[model samples]
Target chain A: FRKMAFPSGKVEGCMVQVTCGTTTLNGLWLDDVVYCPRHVICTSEDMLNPNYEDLLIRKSNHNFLVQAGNVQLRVIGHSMQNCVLKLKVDTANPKTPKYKFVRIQPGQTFSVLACYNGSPSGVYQCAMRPNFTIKGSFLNGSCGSVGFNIDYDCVSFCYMHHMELPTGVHAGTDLEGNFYGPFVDRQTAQAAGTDTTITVNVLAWLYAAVINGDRWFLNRFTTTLNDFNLVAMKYNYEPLTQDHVDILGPLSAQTGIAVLDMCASLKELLQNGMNGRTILGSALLEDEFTPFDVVRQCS
Target chain B: SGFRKMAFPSGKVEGCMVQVTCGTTTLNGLWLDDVVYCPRHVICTSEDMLNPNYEDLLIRKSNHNFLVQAGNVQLRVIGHSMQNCVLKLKVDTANPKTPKYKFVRIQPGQTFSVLACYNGSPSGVYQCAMRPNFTIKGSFLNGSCGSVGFNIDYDCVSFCYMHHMELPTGVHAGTDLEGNFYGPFVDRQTAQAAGTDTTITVNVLAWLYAAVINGDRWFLNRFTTTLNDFNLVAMKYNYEPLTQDHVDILGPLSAQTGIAVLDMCASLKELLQNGMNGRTILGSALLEDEFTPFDVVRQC
Candidate 1:
């Protein structure tokens, strides 16, 4: 299949620092080629305040291949090490180096300022949309392959609405709750044919109520379905669609389909498998801190 | 609009005092929005509680949206308050059976505490709903007539403690227990009579010297300049008088400590400066005309 690009200039080639609802997220974009390492740590902005007085233990790679949706993005230490902090501009030419791959060594800090999408910001996570700039530093043989890694299966968007994985398949909360989106194992999100919109918005509403304790929404969804002449007015929210822009006002079109790739859950809808998994997981209400390499069990 | 099995405070039930947490959504009896600040002091169980110190028995934490009394009843509700607010003794609240509301406005010139009180007690067949709306600016200092037998020159108890300030909580007791008294009663002519005595040994409950900083989401947006007057002074726990323990519980001033006092310009000094002009203080010891310094030899 030929790569399809949207008409809008905002069609992000990769994930940059995009503002979702009240927070922001930075994810390394997946590309068609292996020009650079695709799996890198994309930090989340949700839990900035971790309780650090007492430290935590080591983290295990529970990342199996059974993610409900085919979406799984993992990152070890500094994902940016592959960019600005490593690459150096070729002063031999004066403007900017074209495709100068450096012969690497072991114990030294390195850099690679390569552009994958022709635009300079290409090397940056799903970038180049903001011009030429991405900040990252790399080290040669620092622990070789044993360092920090975040294997998360999710995406970020308007936090008021989020798609979640079904209950059984889980992730640890303390640090895991940091990111938001539907959980998938690996690339199954792209090929498993799961992740739809209906269940996503429904789960978003559920979590919001769960976070602050709103039994009203829970009861309402369970009892009756209200409709204003077929528009489905019972709930205040609906899953984002192609016509989302026309609904949320300034939010343009393209961002809809990109949000799907996830799983669902419901007694009735669970039969369809379109809504991604229903994550009946627990979340830490307060900020908790731990060691960079800590251990936790999926709650 | 529903009740869930909450963690009951040690052996507390039925008419026992309890605290109910609120949420950001409006579900009426369910919970209120976090932005909607509900002051613990604003809940008027009754003008007369066994040991009616709203602050003593009631508790609220920074992590949640509300603070309530334990042991009485556990019902959800909406609460609101301002920095340096007051809980005066007023008798304007309507009976639990009536649809009337006790309107306490704390805006502009009325600069005072957030007016939030629900005298929704005295139940059997009477299920009272606290229709409270607090609009605050500056001008609140201390809650009078509670925790310490209300002091006054007047004798009658009809409009005694709740004469000027009266309110209650969401979940209330179906019946007043041995340890309960929801303030204003249907008394005819009691003797607070003799002009010689000012200390009314009726409802002696006091306050929890604390208020939420600009919890007024509505009043705040309309008046930004007015906000300066509402800043609570954290360094000073000099609101009336604080027991050494009272000081420790509130902790220090950080993102954590909520507003406990009004600002310098908006000093509580004004409330006493005018000598209540028309308002009255209903504590036990202090005379009708006394500033009631924070360092009184015997706290109520």
Candidate 2:
């Protein structure tokens, strides 16, 4: 809650133009003042050239841009050095425009999704200036990927070296810095849809894939159960019945059964996680069952 | 059925009038008689009176409307069709007032069945109809044996690459063109047979591509819809969509090495079912009923 002195008098909620010797920040004064700028260029322990090379914006691919109310700018570290991305949005007005400073790493790509001055609308030219002060030398000297403008609602951005985007509301950092976005609506996920709706639709898909007959999903479905059963046994949780499992096995299997019914028998096997409680009821189990984790495990 | 006509009471009945005449029997004072027609209260006009007419005639017509009270209509087609195939059922037994019907896609020679009941009144001279001008190549059935009342068994040729693999009691089967079965194999022997069928087995890529070229919409829709929903469920658990690399790698690897490319899909499905375990509502059990264990085969 720092106040900047205007020509009239002391102005509250106004982010003042900040400059401390070697470090500088284009302090944008708006109706509401945000946090004090923390763009520190050089510290007491650091001994590097103050006038460093201008961070380069290499060629960019449109696929890297994630569009929302606020845009996400994705760039790779071409210089092979960790650098802070100094982003400024020029509002083309009398007042100081908004800006953001993000830190990225060498040999890696990062993305930032935010709005300057809390305003989403404006034709502001955005740029990235990489700041490298760490004790290291980068032979491949270049700033990063091309700088682009965001003109959407609220875009969720992530570093290129991390996982894919549109991940519900899980928060974590990439190799570069803090990131967020791609939230999933709670209602959409748990609509009052019946089990039959899901089973029918899913079984239909499975049935189609079964065209090769004795295909993978059918077998994989059985194997996953077998795997989960082993864990259940070690944990002393309720293991799936071998009888139910045997029916799904490759031999001695009945030829024509409703997938919905087969799933019903195995439904009990999928349930009963931690202490025989439903897996859906256990956050620990659910947390362990992420898409990436499942992909990693299954693949 | 008998023919009877009843004469209207004489009067300039100022209010709405209703004379229900079923042959000569004129019902005047039942729950049906306590009726006041909208707009014009006078049901029978002077002209209608001179012609000895009445409003709301409950005829002794044998073809009176009645709803078809039944569970489901099952169909087994033993032939094939290049065009879209469907089963349309009209409950013509109950009422002549308005017709009630339902339509379901028939996936080649699969045990294609749907729970169809007439809306409105309960009755049925259940008449089966076919779509896209495709004729039934086998026998059809009506009247309930177990759960479903309407059943139709027809002959449709199998889709060439469709796998006819074996499944447990509650599953379906499929097959490929190379005589390799694709389904839930209960033991190691059957599975190895599929793997070691021909001297040098063609990879999954060949089998999958074949399906892409010759797959039916009904079967394909099942795959796409299930995949979409499963993908959405993963997001609910704070998981992202499958990476392109993962997706790309899955196809070829499964193709090059004959394996099921369903680790991701099965995970999501298993999770969703886990959430709703033992919860029976809507078609959960109904769908279970349609689950034919041994005789049925899914055509991809």
Candidate 3:
């Protein structure tokens, strides 16, 4: 909890406005208390667009918590008022831009998470809009909570590769046969203990598969695990660790541990005799597994 | 890498069919990331769609790269002239006021692919078609596709998933019953040739009825929570929920699809024929056997 003080002229949560002729866009003025100007594009008037990047004041006690992570936006709308959030992630390549629109109902009680393909850097601003209006509609009078210098730090390869398989296996599919994941419920997930067990076991399975040249495992991994290792091997490299093998062999053969046991435990937890309950319950489970920590242990 | 020659309306034609107007200047072809020297007043129209010259434009390419890329343009469609047209598009950085209303006139033979993103990262492509008559069709990238007829093209897996789930609640019959039936066969040849084969048709219909009676009831419950929470009607029914009355109108849909007497038909008929589950109704012989059959036919 760092309570850094703003400069003499810079006040926290003050309204700032940019008047382009008659069109006035209001923004929350601030000193460099928050994560101040991280990067700059140009040394000239082209810097004008860079200056356009500023943080918007919170509407109430709860301002938006917009964080960038591995090809995704983790947004928590902590406000009393329901906000129609419109965010834009623009790469340096002007031709391609990523846009995400979400409506966040009031409170820190809820958060919205979305995933994107191909890790890219971009500036983004989440402006609050009226709910009744369309997805693109935003309130013009006030400047929105802006983070112009936004960037996506692509999650490390080891982190992504280690967790991808376990998560995929967990989120089998919806009742309607749609591919879904992390089907474990809160109670069931707690009972399964730390994510350590599943992570280590899956890592071991993958490691053993690669070392022993298990065709079934490798073939399945090729389809399911994506092109991470396959492409790595094409360059005469294998993404393997001693830790990955150490954990895998020990966990794979143990009495109560294995990929099947993990999957079955989740399946049984979901299948409380009512098929409908199982189908819908799996759908309710959000993917909350933080793989960064898991990566530290394995890598 | 090898580049494939994409056939446009005319041989050797370059540029896209969609036209965008920023203020008075109308730019043809697709341009992105570049600044337009105008205010927000932007309009979009499809040249291929509105032209009488091209007979049809079939969209066959599946990869994101093959699709013509367009972004940050204000598109408005005002022209009445249109035919079968297709545009594989990636549109982003469009604000609400200056650039609204993206009207693409879809004729019977025309198709379009869009990997539409808005705001920032995590914006996946959503497919939605607003017909001239205010009828919404097709499936969204992340949201629910409407009833049995709303087909999600190209991806047969998604199509199968949506259509199977939608069968129970989808009310319409005839063309409507088979609205989403156009997709899910992978290629046009197979989809066109899937004429009432007993195995595919019967098994599919049997499963459809099974999901309706018991299998997909959980979906209904889930849908109920989502409908009230999402403000579906409040959002001008971007995607709507099937009402009880809509579910009640299942006979026409079944008859229209020609799967009237599949295995679950009798079960459906019996269940619906009998009133709400009262003590007398549940105690009856008809009620005793219904639960077991539902279990036997559970497809989900």
Return the top candidate by lDDT. 2
Every model's TM-score: 0.17, 0.16, 0.21
Stronger candidate by lDDT (1 vs 3): 3
Error of 1 at B58 (Å): 35
In model 1, where do residues sit more than 4 Å from their true spots?
Answer: A1-230, A233-299, B1-180, B186-260, B263-300
Interface-residue RMSD per candidate?
A: 30.1, 42.3, 22.8
- Give a tens-digit lDDT track for model 2, residues A73-110: 23221121232232232222233223333433321122
**Residue-wise C-alpha lDDT for candidate 1, range B1-300, written one tens digit per residue:** 011101101100012112233332111110111222122233434342333444543344232344333224333324333322232111222113221112232111111111111221111010111111221111111221111111111121111012122222211111011112232221112221211112111011011121122121111111121223322321132222323343333233212323332221133333323433333222111111121112111121
User: How far in Å is the alpha carbon of A26 misplaced in model 3?
Assistant: 48
| Candidate ranking (DockQ, best to worst) | 3, 2, 1
lDDT of 3 by residue, A1-299 (tens): 00001010111122222222233332222221111111111123432343322313313212222222222222232211111112222222122222222222111011101112111111111111111111111121212222111114211100000011211111111111122222221112311112212232224323332332322212111112223334323433233344434444444453224443333333332233223332211222212111222222123
Model 3 chain A lowest lDDT segment of ten: A155-164
Q: Tell me the deviation in Å of residue B127 in model 2.
A: 41
**TM for chain B in all models?**
0.18, 0.16, 0.23
Instruction: Locate the minimum summed-lDDT window of 10 residues in model 1 chain A.
Output: A290-299
RMSD in Å for all candidates:
26.6, 27.1, 27.6
Indicate the TM-score of model 3.
Answer: 0.21
Q: Mind giving the per-residue lDDT tens digits that candidate 2 earns over B1-300? A: 000010111111101112222223321110012111111111223344333222232121221221122223211222211111111112223222111222233422123221111121111111111111112111111211011112222211221222111222222232222223233222121322222111101121222322333321111212223445655765664333443343454465345333344543553345345553543222121011122211211221
lDDT of 1 by residue, A1-299 (tens): 00101111111222222111332223212221111111211123312332211211121222111111133333222112221111111112121112222221111111112121121111111111011111121111110110011122222211110111221111111111121222221222321122222323233323332333332212212311222212322222233344322322211122221112211112223233324323232221110111111111100
